[PDB]
Amino acid sequence: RFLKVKNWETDVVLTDTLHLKSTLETGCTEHICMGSIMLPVRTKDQLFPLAKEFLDQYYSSIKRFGSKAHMDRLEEVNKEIESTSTYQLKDTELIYGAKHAWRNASRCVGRIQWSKLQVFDARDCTTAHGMFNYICNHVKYATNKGNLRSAITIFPQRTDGKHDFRVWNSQLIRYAGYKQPDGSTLGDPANVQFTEICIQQGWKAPRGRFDVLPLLLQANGNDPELFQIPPELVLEVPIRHPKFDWFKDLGLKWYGLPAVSNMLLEIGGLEFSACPFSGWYMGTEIGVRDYCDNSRYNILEEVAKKMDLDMRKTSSLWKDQALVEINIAVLYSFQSDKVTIVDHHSATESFIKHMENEYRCRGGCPADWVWIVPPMSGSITPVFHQEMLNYRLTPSFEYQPDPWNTHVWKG
Amino acid sequence: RFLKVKNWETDVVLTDTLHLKSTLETGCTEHICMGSIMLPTKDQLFPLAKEFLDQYYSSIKRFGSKAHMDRLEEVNKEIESTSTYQLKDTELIYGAKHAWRNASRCVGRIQWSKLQVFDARDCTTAHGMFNYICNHVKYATNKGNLRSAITIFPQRTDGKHDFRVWNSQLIRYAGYKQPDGSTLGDPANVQFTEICIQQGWKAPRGRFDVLPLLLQANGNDPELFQIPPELVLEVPIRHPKFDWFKDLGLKWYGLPAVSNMLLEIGGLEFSACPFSGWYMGTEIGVRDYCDNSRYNILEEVAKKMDLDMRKTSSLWKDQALVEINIAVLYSFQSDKVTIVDHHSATESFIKHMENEYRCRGGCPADWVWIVPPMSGSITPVFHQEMLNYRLTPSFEYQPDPWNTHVW
Numbered sequence: 010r011f012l013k014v015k016n017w018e019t020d021v022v023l024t025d026t027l028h029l030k031s032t033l034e035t036g037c038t039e040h041i042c043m044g045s046i047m048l049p050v051r052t053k054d055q056l057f058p059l060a061k062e063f064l065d066q067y068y069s070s071i072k073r074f075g076s077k078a079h080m081d082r083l084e085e086v087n088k089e090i091e092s093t094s095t096y097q098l099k100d101t102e103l104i105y106g107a108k109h110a111w112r113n114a115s116r117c118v119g120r121i122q123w124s125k126l127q128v129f130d131a132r133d134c135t136t137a138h139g140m141f142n143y144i145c146n147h148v149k150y151a152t153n154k155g156n157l158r159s160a161i162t163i164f165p166q167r168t169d170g171k172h173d174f175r176v177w178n179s180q181l182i183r184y185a186g187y188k189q190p191d192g193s194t195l196g197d198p199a200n201v202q203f204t205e206i207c208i209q210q211g212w213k214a215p216r217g218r219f220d221v222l223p224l225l226l227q228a229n230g231n232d233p234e235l236f237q238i239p240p241e242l243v244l245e246v247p248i249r250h251p252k253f254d255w256f257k258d259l260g261l262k263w264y265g266l267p268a269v270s271n272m273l274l275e276i277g278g279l280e281f282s283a284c285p286f287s288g289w290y291m292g293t294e295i296g297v298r299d300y301c302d303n304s305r306y307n308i309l310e311e312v313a314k315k316m317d318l319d320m321r322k323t324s325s326l327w328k329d330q331a332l333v334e335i336n337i338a339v340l341y342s343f344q345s346d347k348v349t350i351v352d353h354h355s356a357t358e359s360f361i362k363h364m365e366n367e368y369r370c371r372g373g374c375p376a377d378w379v380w381i382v383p384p385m386s387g388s389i390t391p392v393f394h395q396e397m398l399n400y401r402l403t404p405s406f407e408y409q410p411d412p413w414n415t416h417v418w419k420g
Numbered sequence: 421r422f423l424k425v426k427n428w429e430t431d432v433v434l435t436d437t438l439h440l441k442s443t444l445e446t447g448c449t450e451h452i453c454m455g456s457i458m459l460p461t462k463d464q465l466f467p468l469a470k471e472f473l474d475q476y477y478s479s480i481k482r483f484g485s486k487a488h489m490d491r492l493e494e495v496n497k498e499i500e501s502t503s504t505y506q507l508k509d510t511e512l513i514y515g516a517k518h519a520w521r522n523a524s525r526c527v528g529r530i531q532w533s534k535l536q537v538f539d540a541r542d543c544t545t546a547h548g549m550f551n552y553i554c555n556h557v558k559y560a561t562n563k564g565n566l567r568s569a570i571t572i573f574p575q576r577t578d579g580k581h582d583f584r585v586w587n588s589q590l591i592r593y594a595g596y597k598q599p600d601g602s603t604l605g606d607p608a609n610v611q612f613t614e615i616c617i618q619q620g621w622k623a624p625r626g627r628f629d630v631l632p633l634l635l636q637a638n639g640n641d642p643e644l645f646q647i648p649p650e651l652v653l654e655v656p657i658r659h660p661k662f663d664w665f666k667d668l669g670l671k672w673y674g675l676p677a678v679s680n681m682l683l684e685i686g687g688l689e690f691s692a693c694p695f696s697g698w699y700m701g702t703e704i705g706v707r708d709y710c711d712n713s714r715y716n717i718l719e720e721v722a723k724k725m726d727l728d729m730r731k732t733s734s735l736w737k738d739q740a741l742v743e744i745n746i747a748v749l750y751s752f753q754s755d756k757v758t759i760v761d762h763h764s765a766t767e768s769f770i771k772h773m774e775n776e777y778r779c780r781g782g783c784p785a786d787w788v789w790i791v792p793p794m795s796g797s798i799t800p801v802f803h804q805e806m807l808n809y810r811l812t813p814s815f816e817y818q819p820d821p822w823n824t825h826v827w
């Protein structure tokens with residue numbers, strides 16, 4: 010089967026064949042599209058075909074499909090599965106697997122970088138203290154004094170689902186949020202629930218607008234333990250504007266390292282429930298969403314005030330105007346401090362080139378338009394005009410339940 | 421089966437039951453989502469008629485009534501006899517309004533129940549079509565106080581006597597390929613302009629030439645007519661802060677009027693059904709002016725603003741985009757031509773969506789189209805999960821007539 014996508018700006022038409030390898034479901038049916046919906050222990054019987062499918066892909070990628078080495082590895086994995094009910098990946102397969110989960114991530118605009126990923130194998134980790142050490146090392150490596158390097162740290166895979174390794178933080182670096190008795194919020198309103206958990210677990214909260222949350226780390230299914238990332242490892246950037254000298258006095262800053270820690274990495278049917286990964290920011294993530302969502306720092310009003318825009322009616326476009334200036338400030342600040350960041354024009358243009366390269370060399374590039382298009386200035390980026398096909402390939406990154414909802418407390 | 425949609429800004433969760441009434445297909449499957457793709461007999465006819473008449477009679481609190489059953493038998497009798505059937509005026513009006521109500525890509529549907537329906541089913545000739553369209557344009561325009569309207573020409577019969585308006589929209593600007601490779605006017609309309617010239621239109625070869633109507637009646641050959649210039653309301657574009665903006669020579673027309681879609685009601689097909697509302701500012705200021713394949717004015721504006729255009733990260737494109745959109749809204753408002761900004765429009769749609777869930781069990785919506793082409797996440801629709809599905813009556817895409825036409 011062949012599927013065509015068209016770019017309505019250029020009339021370029023691409024043909025997808027890679028979708029034939031899709032597996033998991035989309036949520037959609039012939040009667041309903043769930044394209045804008047955000048959210049969607051394994052028997053030996055289901056495990057070996059998953060392992061085999063993965064190993065066939067791995068061995069094809071290294072041009073050894075059907076080799077004695079390929080056949081021996083399948084044999085070895087089959088035996089390990091029937092004997093032990095699971096299997097262990099070779100370091101080469103783990104690295105291949107992690108890179109392809111990123112390559113396959115349909116919501117990621119940054120995938121041109123997929124083959125450049127430092128993989129830290131933490132499968133020998135046994136305690137929350139061990140996890141803390143591995144994560145500090147990841148943060149320091151990935152930060153690299155502002156010259157950011159993509160990385161992922163992989164903790165031991167799931168066994169019976171009662172011994173999961175989990176990082177309870179949704180992201181490695183995030184600011185606390187505090188609900189006040191008057192209903193107002195101090196800090197990042199997105200993190201109020203998690204902050205309360207940390208405090209309950211014994212964290213002494215400074216109660217400021219930008220407090221870096223402690224790590225809450227769960228090893229081998231045990232109760233999670235709190236750790237504070239060394240402050241000297243947490244790179245932050247004070248936000249200022251190149252023309253507006255008063256912008257600095259907003260008191261804004263952000264951290265340099267975007268590091269997602271709540272997702273699950275699936276490779277060959279194995280499940281890595283703790284696999285924190287990091288790259289570098291696209292400016293809009295901070296300037297548009299973090300700062301300007303009504304449910305986040307919500308700074309549009311204050312900024313527009315200081316610009317003395319007409320705020321009496323929406324049609325003056327005061328919000329749009331302030332939004333651009335904020336996003337200029339973010340890019341300017343990171344650049345000035347030599348912390349890696351990419352603007353939404355650069356990133357989407359690079360993505361289009363990546364996507365076209367993938368169509369040619371791979372037969373497709375699954376992509377979720379809803380997430381790929383930036384949250385400001387959508388149609389003046391090339392991705393807006395690009396038809397995309399969303400489907401799910403493995404290896405993959407998946408959502409998983411929040412650990413506080415499923416954890417059985419030891420006490 | 422019973423589906424929940426969540427708003428991620430407010431945490432409000434809504435429950436959709438209306439999707440089970442859907443009938444047409446999405447293009448999506450369990451393996452692949454095509455949400456971002458832009459264009460994915462007597463036996464056939466009576467269940468379509470029945471389905472429609474049932475919903476109509478339900479809407480007027482007369483389901484299962486004798487008038488309901490009587491209507492059902494009458495239409496059924498008419499279909500066996502004549503192969504088709506004729507809608508009552510009440511049914512036509514209901515159907516047209518519900519087609520708009522069901523339009524998943526339309527952000528302006530809070531207005532759906534206030535639609536003036538012009539019944540043009542008595543039209544027989546292209547000159548007749550022209551008269552009707554002028555009247556629509558004048559009514560809809562209302563001296564700048566815009567009123568939503570649809571004009572409905574005779575329904576498809578054998579498919580060989582289709583009424584078609586060959587124009588994609590009632591009011592648009594010509595496009596011309598220039599000798600020096602450039603494009604004069606609206607690049608989107610170069611091919612249609614050529615067909616007009618082919619058919620004998622004397623083109624002025626300017627930048628904003630209002631295209632003539634190419635009208636086809638009863639499957640006959642399309643004919644050319646020019647909309648009276650005095651009925652085409654246009655707005656010169658100026659900026660409230662930048663005195664130089666007027667020097668760009670920009671203008672746009674006040675009436676957005678789609679004329680290439682097909683209206684399906686009760687299985688009947690209306691291939692010529694031009695409809696109009698009023699503009700949302702971003703349609704002109706973001707897409708019409710700033711698309712690279714359209715008037716593509718970003719560079720010129722940025723230069724007049726003296727922005728640093730050396731690198732993308734100065735966000736010079738974004739700054740100029742905002743100012744262009746300020747100018748559009750200001751110009752329309754200053755001349756008292758109805759327009760809505762993307763904030764007001766999306767806020768209205770959220771309220772409409774909540775009404776529809778509360779009173780109808782849902783609202784089919786295409787997020788890819790509903791979210792405005794600038795400032796997406798500062799509008800509330802960005803954070804609103806939406807379910808897209810096809811309900812009838814509906815507006816459908818149809819083949820461009822010049823590919824279909826046996827001349």
Ligand code: HEM
Pocket residue numbers: 107111114116117118119120122126159160161286287288289290291294351356380406
């Ligand atoms: C190197 C530079 C990178 C850039 C510029 C980038 C950009 C982005 C952006 C802007 C998003 C949307 C995030 C949001 O809206 O919350 C995203 C999502 C995502 N990224 Fe990338 N990313 C990068 C690196 C990586 C790496 C190294 C990985 C994994 C190894 C990755 C995997 C993902 C995944 C799985 C998502 C979907 C996240 C979700 O569903 O919440 N990205 N990326």
Ligand code: HEM
Pocket residue numbers: 520523525526527528529531535568569570695696697698699700703760765789815
């Ligand atoms: C009265 C104010 C109205 C507003 C503010 C409005 C707004 C919009 C906008 C912004 C779009 C996207 C168009 C594009 O990006 O090309 C759209 C699409 C659409 N509108 Fe509405 N509209 C209005 C009236 C109407 C009426 C009266 C009808 C029908 C009777 C209608 C039916 C549709 C349909 C079928 C689409 C999808 C068109 C397509 O797929 O090309 N709209 N509308």
Ligand SMILES: CNCCCc1cc(F)cc(CCc2cc(C)cc(N)n2)c1
Pocket residue numbers: 119180182183267268269286287288289290291294
């Ligand atoms: C609905 N989503 C809620 C959480 C969003 C989020 C929060 C955060 F602190 C950090 C991120 C980082 C996302 C990301 C991850 C990576 C690896 C690179 C990059 N540029 N961006 C996301």
Ligand SMILES: CNCCCc1cc(F)cc(CCc2cc(C)cc(N)n2)c1
Pocket residue numbers: 528589591592676677678695696697698699700703
């Ligand atoms: C892929 N799209 C190609 C055509 C875009 C378009 C051009 C136009 F002149 C006029 C329109 C009208 C869209 C519209 C229609 C109506 C009825 C109201 C409103 N605000 N906007 C669209």
Ligand SMILES: C[C@H](O)[C@H](O)[C@H]1CNc2nc(N)[nH]c(=O)c2N1
Pocket residue numbers: 045046047379380381428802803804805806
């Ligand atoms: C409801 C909708 O799916 C949701 O708001 C999405 C839209 N697109 C997005 N795109 C990105 N990159 N990140 C997001 O959080 C979202 N949120």
Ligand SMILES: C[C@H](O)[C@H](O)[C@H]1CNc2nc(N)[nH]c(=O)c2N1
Pocket residue numbers: 017393394395396397455456457458788789790
């Ligand atoms: C490829 C993508 O589907 C296409 O560019 C769509 C995106 N969303 C849109 N949304 C609206 N309202 N109008 C459009 O023309 C488009 N174009």
Ligand SMILES: [Zn+2]
Pocket residue numbers: 037041042043044448449452453454455
């Ligand atoms: Zn879909």
